């Protein structure tokens, strides 16, 4: 499992994402009952609160598995929403922010 430093780094980056102005579509799970089509086409839904619960409960054995789930949030967003939609653009902006933060942390 991840040591204390790695857990702290994941938590720090996740908090920076949760507080970003463009995080609003990604803070909680998509409600599959209220958003038709989502369950059908998005096979692995993911959101920041779920990532937080996974991190806290020891479900990420390493940094790479954490980053995969963060990226999954944005990959799902790209599929379900038009690139030019408010959510689509929020997702692209958040991906850019994450990749910069990730690169600045581990370089």
């Amino acid at each position: 499992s991840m040591d204390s430093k790695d857990l702290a780094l994941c938590s720090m980056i996740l908090t920076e994402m949760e507080t970003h102005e463009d995080a609003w579509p990604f803070l909680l799970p998509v409600n599959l009952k209220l958003v038709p089509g989502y369950k059908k086409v998005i096979k692995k839904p993911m959101d920041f609160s779920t990532i937080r619960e996974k991190l806290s409960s020891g479900q990420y054995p390493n940094l790479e598995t954490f980053a995969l789930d963060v990226r999954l949030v944005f990959d799902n967003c790209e599929t379900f929403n038009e690139d030019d939609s408010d959510i689509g653009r929020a997702g692209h902006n958040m991906r850019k922010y994450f990749e910069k933060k990730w690169t600045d942390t581990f370089k």
């Binding site: 958003v35 038709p36 089509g37 086409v41 599929t79 379900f80 929403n81 038009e82 939609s85 959510i87």
Partner: peptide, 7 residues
């Protein structure tokens, strides 16, 4: 109805 999105 057909198509994706949250509009």
């Amino acid at each position: 109805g057909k198509g994706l999105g949250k509009g």
